[PDB]
Write an enzyme that holds these catalytic residues in place. Structure first.
Site, PDB file in Angstrom:
ATOM      1  CG  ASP A 189       2.586  54.634  40.094  1.00 11.28           C
ATOM      2  OD1 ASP A 189       1.939  55.669  40.362  1.00 11.28           O
ATOM      3  OD2 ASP A 189       2.368  53.533  40.641  1.00 11.28           O
ATOM      4  CG  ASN A 247      11.595  47.847  49.886  1.00  7.83           C
ATOM      5  OD1 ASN A 247      12.634  47.744  50.538  1.00  7.83           O
ATOM      6  ND2 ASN A 247      10.393  47.611  50.407  1.00  7.83           N
TER       7      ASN A 247
HETATM    8  N1  LIG Z   1       4.014  47.741  32.329  1.00 10.38           N
HETATM    9  C1  LIG Z   1       5.357  48.069  32.816  1.00 10.38           C
HETATM   10  C2  LIG Z   1       6.105  46.852  33.329  1.00 10.38           C
HETATM   11  C3  LIG Z   1       7.479  47.190  33.893  1.00 10.38           C
HETATM   12  C4  LIG Z   1       7.442  47.637  35.335  1.00 10.38           C
HETATM   13  O1  LIG Z   1       7.892  46.929  36.231  1.00 10.38           O
HETATM   14  N2  LIG Z   1       6.910  48.836  35.563  1.00 10.38           N
HETATM   15  C5  LIG Z   1       6.883  49.451  36.883  1.00 10.38           C
HETATM   16  C6  LIG Z   1       5.717  48.981  37.732  1.00 10.38           C
HETATM   17  O2  LIG Z   1       5.915  49.392  39.105  1.00 10.38           O
HETATM   18  C7  LIG Z   1       4.793  50.139  39.536  1.00 10.38           C
HETATM   19  N3  LIG Z   1       5.223  51.121  40.520  1.00 10.38           N
HETATM   20  C8  LIG Z   1       6.061  52.210  40.339  1.00 10.38           C
HETATM   21  C9  LIG Z   1       6.682  52.489  39.087  1.00 10.38           C
HETATM   22  C10 LIG Z   1       7.269  52.766  38.085  1.00 10.38           C
HETATM   23  C11 LIG Z   1       8.060  53.088  36.898  1.00 10.38           C
HETATM   24  O3  LIG Z   1       9.020  52.080  36.598  1.00 10.38           O
HETATM   25  C12 LIG Z   1      10.252  52.287  37.287  1.00 10.38           C
HETATM   26  C13 LIG Z   1      10.235  51.556  38.607  1.00 10.38           C
HETATM   27  O4  LIG Z   1      10.158  50.135  38.397  1.00 10.38           O
HETATM   28  C14 LIG Z   1      10.483  49.522  39.630  1.00 10.38           C
HETATM   29  N4  LIG Z   1      11.073  48.213  39.369  1.00 10.38           N
HETATM   30  C15 LIG Z   1      12.198  47.931  38.638  1.00 10.38           C
HETATM   31  N5  LIG Z   1      12.530  46.662  38.636  1.00 10.38           N
HETATM   32  C16 LIG Z   1      11.550  46.064  39.418  1.00 10.38           C
HETATM   33  C17 LIG Z   1      11.332  44.731  39.811  1.00 10.38           C
HETATM   34  N6  LIG Z   1      12.127  43.713  39.467  1.00 10.38           N
HETATM   35  N7  LIG Z   1      10.258  44.476  40.590  1.00 10.38           N
HETATM   36  C18 LIG Z   1       9.466  45.490  40.946  1.00 10.38           C
HETATM   37  N8  LIG Z   1       9.574  46.785  40.640  1.00 10.38           N
HETATM   38  C19 LIG Z   1      10.644  47.009  39.869  1.00 10.38           C
HETATM   39  C20 LIG Z   1      11.410  50.488  40.395  1.00 10.38           C
HETATM   40  O5  LIG Z   1      10.862  50.812  41.668  1.00 10.38           O
HETATM   41  C21 LIG Z   1      11.475  51.720  39.476  1.00 10.38           C
HETATM   42  O6  LIG Z   1      11.426  52.933  40.218  1.00 10.38           O
HETATM   43  N9  LIG Z   1       6.273  52.900  41.446  1.00 10.38           N
HETATM   44  C22 LIG Z   1       5.548  52.210  42.411  1.00 10.38           C
HETATM   45  C23 LIG Z   1       5.408  52.403  43.799  1.00 10.38           C
HETATM   46  N10 LIG Z   1       5.993  53.396  44.476  1.00 10.38           N
HETATM   47  N11 LIG Z   1       4.655  51.514  44.483  1.00 10.38           N
HETATM   48  C24 LIG Z   1       4.084  50.509  43.816  1.00 10.38           C
HETATM   49  N12 LIG Z   1       4.140  50.227  42.512  1.00 10.38           N
HETATM   50  C25 LIG Z   1       4.894  51.117  41.861  1.00 10.38           C
HETATM   51  C26 LIG Z   1       4.147  50.695  38.269  1.00 10.38           C
HETATM   52  O7  LIG Z   1       2.771  50.993  38.481  1.00 10.38           O
HETATM   53  C27 LIG Z   1       4.337  49.506  37.328  1.00 10.38           C
HETATM   54  O8  LIG Z   1       3.336  48.520  37.556  1.00 10.38           O
END
Ligand SMILES: NCCCC(=O)NC[C@H]1O[C@@H](n2c(C#CCOC[C@H]3O[C@@H](n4cnc5c(N)ncnc54)[C@H](O)[C@@H]3O)nc3c(N)ncnc32)[C@H](O)[C@@H]1O
Ligand SMILES: NCCCC(=O)NC[C@H]1O[C@@H](n2c(C#CCOC[C@H]3O[C@@H](n4cnc5c(N)ncnc54)[C@H](O)[C@@H]3O)nc3c(N)ncnc32)[C@H](O)[C@@H]1O
Ligand SMILES: NCCCC(=O)NC[C@H]1O[C@@H](n2c(C#CCOC[C@H]3O[C@@H](n4cnc5c(N)ncnc54)[C@H](O)[C@@H]3O)nc3c(N)ncnc32)[C@H](O)[C@@H]1O
Ligand SMILES: NCCCC(=O)NC[C@H]1O[C@@H](n2c(C#CCOC[C@H]3O[C@@H](n4cnc5c(N)ncnc54)[C@H](O)[C@@H]3O)nc3c(N)ncnc32)[C@H](O)[C@@H]1O
Lengths: 261, 261, 261, 261
Positions: free
Chosen positions: B45, B161
């Site tokens: 993603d 979110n």
């Molecule tokens: N191995 C890497 C580990 C690092 C990793 O957390 N990486 C991002 C993770 O997210 C998933 N993801 C994304 C993405 C992305 C690309 O990063 C940017 C996005 O991080 C999210 N992000 C930031 N801080 C967060 C937090 N504390 N908890 C949850 N998400 C968080 C934001 O929202 C950004 O926009 N979009 C969606 C979506 N539309 N639906 C469900 N899952 C989604 C990805 O497959 C991956 O598992």
């Protein structure tokens, strides 16, 4: 027009009702509680919900108005001091209507009944454990184990839904929101946890796994249903209509009720 | 048509890209990364978000497709084993497009810049305390004190979110959702707490109280903005378009990603 | 020593019980279900809770052991494959005991009954609204309105308490934890929201406001109490004792049950 | 005795300090800010935290007292109107001391530094993603992905810990509580979610996975640490001592700060 007034039944509400009835008597307004076109609720949000379910068969021909004699309500959003201005404006007409979405609940039995909700419909177990299969648009989504589930209308999202961690939704969005009540999550049992917001025409079906007896609530009404095979939720095609005489935005009502006033 | 393929840059993704490029070479398909009409993302993603921001000036002329070489993505929802069927179907056309809402972020400075988000836009403080006034449609709603705020698109609701307790929304709903990051609530400080879901044309404005410097993120891009006077959020008039070749419902993607597969 | 074995009653548990009884027959072990000194539970955590309440009058003279024939339990933490090693080690003695805190519940009526809980004690309303005054050490703390309240032991914190958002506490801490079930919070109604952790000798009292009838649960047992004037919670002076034959730390049990195994 | 007085530095606090200094001048009290035995803080809880860290090398020889010139604080729990009664009682002695637990933080580097916290210690990432391995008593518990982690003392549980969903703990419990900041949970990433409460002598270790640079906060002090190999948390053997002149129970302070006053 034809109108009626329901009252919480305490001294303040009964006498406000009698004074408003006297004020309507100076206009071309007939008191008719069988086929009214304006339904005024005097009391709280509970009184307003009773007025809605009292006339839910003529929703398209009725505009609702709520007056709160206690604290501010989300449906009863007029103060008692403005009853006179309200009597006059209602009689002079020239008010616009606003419409909020409703929730349709269908309960199918073994060997069918429908309900409309203005706040929400909830399902709980008959004392024992609550296990239901959650099916979204014929697709099995999760096996829920916990205390129960709550499906809320937009205007209902500030009520039970809010206490369960659900989001507050502006009532212009035609949607319904499903929240969990104390779901169990471990190595073998798994739910989504997050609240779910569904658009129009999506159907959420709850189907029993073991016990077929559930406590089903529609707004304030809670009944024990037996031999249930399915509980179906969808946004209703029907809408509740309010009479609006000035701007009182939803987010301002939210602010006034939960933040400060 | 004209197409391009972006890659995560690892060995598996680069060689899938080269094999797909070879497959397109057997059709009337020209590789053009300047003015493509089909953008294929191979990776996760994060790779798909880069492809979206790489071409966010031609969103109306592009249909996006995501292939996941690692775990299933919410945007990269095609398996590498179906690259060949995908090459052929894309070249034969006759696919329908689906469109998801986007979030517009406007940052005004002292003495204006706009951004589109596919997942969310977040605001945090430059290390110190974060205090902003939250104004909804010119109405002061709350003074937020805490770690920050997150405004999510529907397809973004399963990302940051979700971790902040927000509801999951079907992407057919044109809305945005605001969630709090660790808000302080005591006798003197008060926020709504619950996530807030806003319809089209509602404007949410964040205005500084003391410090005027904030860390503002749009999807993956995080930058420090200085002399900020206002951050404005609204559902964008623009939409991202996907190419769809078979039914893969949003709630099934939710099930496959969070419940079981 | 004297011992007894309780069984879930399914085929796997009954026959493991019969095989263990045969193994004990090769030692100086007498089956006595009246005055045992070792109580073995074969089944799940529900079976173990029944064994605890079956012998809660002789807690100081009994060491408990749980065998899980289904998934791993937090109390039934021995695998069926180690029944033989367990038979022998129990007969050879030389095992150390570990002790977990318990919760004392006192229910006073109008015009007194005590209970011990290993997991938790919960209070809900008889269908209608649930309003209780919460008094901590004779100090009025809050007026709770909502679905109910749950007071958990440390070992109980991974059960209902966890689903209600409570913290997980190591069982070496002599404490109890109070969690809310769907509390209403607006301009007029206010609770703390957060879970509360109480040390030894603190007394939490729930006192009715309107309805005097409540559904009171102690672990698995749920009964309707009428004419209740007070429900008192405190950490019990009594403790449940386990037989320990090797290191299986609480945080490892938590990891194995909720994270991975 | 020897005493000193720290001030928030505004007009109300500076002049209360000067008036209290004048009142102490009528007793055998020497102002000594090098080796005091009584430290009076005038301001808010932030002022009190500065006074604690100003003298954290002589914690066993000092009794602290906090006066709040603004809203009621959890550490500054005396009103300015009682400064005179406080001057006299402090000089006449015959007050009992109360002690609250503290949190020890150890930061080991590549190729060691210790801190005491009165509220909490938190860890966040240097802007990028935050991934740490959580090890409890040498046992790998979880791989945390999210915004950060917070380890709170009992008296700290009403501060940041509360905003992150942690339980409120009575300060007579010698424990520490770990809360998550926006953890990601899907099919591949998994954390416990619930807050964790640890007893004395348990050691929680955070170990980097990729990036070795973290933002580490101890109460109000936040610094960027580089080449970190481990962050270790345990309940400190040290305690902060307060001077107590009358009964102001912790649960009453909780009530007064979050419910009503
Ligand atoms: N191995 C890497 C580990 C690092 C990793 O957390 N990486 C991002 C993770 O997210 C998933 N993801 C994304 C993405 C992305 C690309 O990063 C940017 C996005 O991080 C999210 N992000 C930031 N801080 C967060 C937090 N504390 N908890 C949850 N998400 C968080 C934001 O929202 C950004 O926009 N979009 C969606 C979506 N539309 N639906 C469900 N899952 C989604 C990805 O497959 C991956 O598992
Ligand atoms: N002094 C009485 C104390 C008892 C009282 O809780 N009464 C209901 C309270 O709710 C408010 N309310 C209602 C209502 C109502 C009429 O009861 C039925 C509704 O109870 C809600 N309900 C049930 N169990 C709940 C719970 N655990 N937490 C929160 N709400 C809960 C459901 O949703 C029912 O449908 N609708 C809305 C709304 N649209 N927006 C915001 N606030 C709303 C009322 O002004 C009142 O403050
Ligand atoms: N296939 C059956 C499905 C039904 C089932 O939920 N069964 C109980 C489940 O719990 C686990 N459990 C128990 C137990 C038990 C025996 O039931 C009574 C306990 O239900 C809990 N309970 C009640 N309502 C709950 C809810 N909404 N969410 C979570 N738990 C809830 C209470 O706390 C009772 O005291 N103790 C602990 C513990 N110490 N640590 C972690 N896990 C525990 C059992 O292995 C089983 O998975
Ligand atoms: N007008 C100023 C607005 C700014 C302000 O939030 N200021 C701190 C607020 O906290 C209260 N406070 C403190 C403090 C302090 C001194 O700041 C450092 C502490 O910020 C906390 N902190 C940091 N980020 C937080 C967040 N997102 N939510 C909640 N708290 C957060 C941490 O825990 C630090 O250690 N200790 C306790 C306590 N023991 N019990 C209950 N309330 C407490 C203060 O009276 C004040 O209301």
């Amino acid at each position: 027009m034809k109108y009626m007034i329901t009252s919480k039944g305490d001294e303040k509400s009964d006498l406000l009702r009698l004074n408003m009835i006297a004020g309507f008597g100076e206009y071309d307004m007939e008191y008719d509680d069988v086929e009214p076109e304006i339904v005024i609720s005097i009391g709280g949000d509970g009184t307003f919900l009773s007025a809605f379910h009292q006339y839910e068969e003529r929703l398209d021909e009725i505009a609702f108005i709520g007056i709160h004699t206690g604290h501010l309500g989300f449906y009863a959003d007029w103060r008692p001091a403005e009853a006179d201005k309200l009597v006059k404006l209602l009689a002079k007409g020239e008010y616009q209507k606003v419409s909020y979405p409703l929730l349709k609940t269908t309960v199918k039995y073994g060997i069918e009944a429908t309900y409309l909700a203005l706040n929400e419909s909830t399902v709980k177990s008959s004392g024992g454990p609550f296990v239901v299969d959650v099916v979204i648009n014929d697709i099995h989504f999760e096996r829920f184990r916990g205390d129960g589930l709550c499906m809320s209308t937009p205007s209902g999202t500030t009520a039970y839904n809010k206490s369960l961690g659900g989001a507050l939704m502006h009532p212009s969005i035609e949607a319904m929101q499903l929240t969990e009540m104390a779901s169990i999550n471990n190595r073998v049992y798994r739910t989504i946890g997050s609240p779910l917001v569904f658009p129009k025409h999506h159907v959420v079906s709850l189907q029993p796994v073991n016990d077929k007896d559930f406590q089903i609530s529609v707004d304030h009404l809670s009944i024990l249903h037996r031999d249930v095979q399915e509980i179906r939720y969808e946004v209703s095609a029907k809408k509740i209509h309010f009479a609006r005489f000035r701007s009182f935005p939803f987010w301002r009502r939210v602010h006034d009720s939960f933040i400060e006033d």
